[PDB]
Design a protein around this ligand. Structure first.
Ligand SMILES: CCOc1cccc2sc(C(=N)N)cc12
Ligand SMILES: CCOc1cccc2sc(C(=N)N)cc12
Ligand SMILES: [Mg+2]
Ligand SMILES: [Mg+2]
Ligand SMILES: [Mg+2]
Ligand SMILES: [Mg+2]
Ligand SMILES: [Mg+2]
Ligand SMILES: [Mg+2]
Lengths: 236, 5, 236, 5
């Protein structure tokens, strides 16, 4: 590990500087180094890890979608044959994206999840596992596609089961998990009715628990509730 | 695309 | 060169795909590979090269400025000592930025400039040489700082001399050169009066030549004239 | 910052 000689605290500090500088690849490399120190991550550290890799993979996904659309146009009837280049470059971006996902999943399996006992850590990491298998599923076409989808589903479902037993319905981790699992159902599993049902039930159960919250907690929860409503509006 | 966090 | 086995035309095609996907590091790597094929670049190819590296170095400059400002705050009286980390990370970004500049300057010296005989190619490459020495000057503090500034000045001045003899005053390359050399004077050489004079004379001489242009050329030239005016407004 | 191209 290129970060093996850097102090854990210095890696965390530099991840925060990289965030301020919008250097998300650096941020992710610093947080990977911090994870590889072997200690559990605090709440703030878990979110630094997720912010970093979400920005990296998000850029890769956006680029993959542009290239995939170009490739699809180049393959329809009447199109001029442009050679192997579009496929090759889409494949390059896809392989890099898969590499990022494999790296995140590797950190979760070695050994973040197995040491995560509190709901706020374990649900967060299982949500991340579902998310990164979902990103793999977005680009998957081979013999293992169904297994990739099922790996995402299984991780999301374990996270859901814990979240329902161990967190209030307004907990922002629980809400974001449900939001993302709902998108998994809609976009990956071809289950739009399950997606809509999950978003609606999550929103309504959160609404009913808002009365228990402080002003700051209310803001955190209602922000994600609005994303649930935004998706419901898109889908109905 | 739909919203995720 | 990792791009040595790829066809020149395929590198150019992939640079255009990378631009569409907003993958500017890839775009720059493809265009570097195309330059290293050894053939002169067409107008479109020169602009693909410049767009790619301008986006890459622009992101590095923005990040360097954020980190430099944090470092400056951490070094003023009353600040809590935060350790070497801010300086170290600013230095990391700075070294990467310098590496990009050295790479561009290397392409220009081996061997784009020496084969560029037409004004539109030679002025463009000399402008780029001035620009990348200017980016080096923005971060320079050592024994060679004055030589870095003078290298930028010398390249800009040769480009100016050719542009005045061989291009109309509305030529967009000539205009962009003058815009950037004016910024060099203001921000690098501590010569705000020269910066203002150059921007004003460039704008006025372009204005007087607009009558010769087609509608499309007029749009290209007036776009850059507006940037000259924007800078004059900032500076007066 | 001032404009450059
Ligand atoms: C609540 C969700 O995430 C956080 C919890 C607690 C501290 C922090 S700091 C931070 C950041 N982007 N640097 C994110 C968080
Ligand atoms: C006029 C300034 O630059 C260009 C001239 C001619 C063709 C092209 S294509 C292109 C591009 N960003 N892909 C830029 C240019
Ligand atoms: Mg230690
Ligand atoms: Mg593939
Ligand atoms: Mg259920
Ligand atoms: Mg060939
Ligand atoms: Mg240095
Ligand atoms: Mg003069």
């Amino acid at each position: 590990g290129a970060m093996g000689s850097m102090e854990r605290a210095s890696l965390i500090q530099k991840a925060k500087l990289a965030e301020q500088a919008e250097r998300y690849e650096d941020m992710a490399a610093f947080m990977k180094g911090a994870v590889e120190k072997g200690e559990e991550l605090s709440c703030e550290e878990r979110n630094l890890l997720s912010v970093a890799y979400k920005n990296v993979v998000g850029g890769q996904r956006a680029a993959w979608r542009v290239l995939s659309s170009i490739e699809q146009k180049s393959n329809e009837e009447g199109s001029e044959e442009k050679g192997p280049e579009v496929r090759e470059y889409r494949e390059k971006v896809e392989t890099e994206l898969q590499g990022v996902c494999d790296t995140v999943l590797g950190l979760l399996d070695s050994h973040l999840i197995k040491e995560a006992g509190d709901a706020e850590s374990r649900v967060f990491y299982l949500k991340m596992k579902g998310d990164y298998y979902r990103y793999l599923a977005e680009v998957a076409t081979g013999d293992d596609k169904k297994r990739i989808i099922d790996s995402a589903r299984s991780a999301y479902q374990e996270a859901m089961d814990i979240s329902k037993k161990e967190m209030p319905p307004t907990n922002p981790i629980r809400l974001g998990l449900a939001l993302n699992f709902s998108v998994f159902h809609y976009e990956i599993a071809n289950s739009p009715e399950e997606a809509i049902s999950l978003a609606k039930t999550t929103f309504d159960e959160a609404m009913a628990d808002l009365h228990t919250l402080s002003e700051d907690s209310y803001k955190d929860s209602t922000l994600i509730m609005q994303l649930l409503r935004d998706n419901l509006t898109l889908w109905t | 695309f739909p919203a995720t966090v």
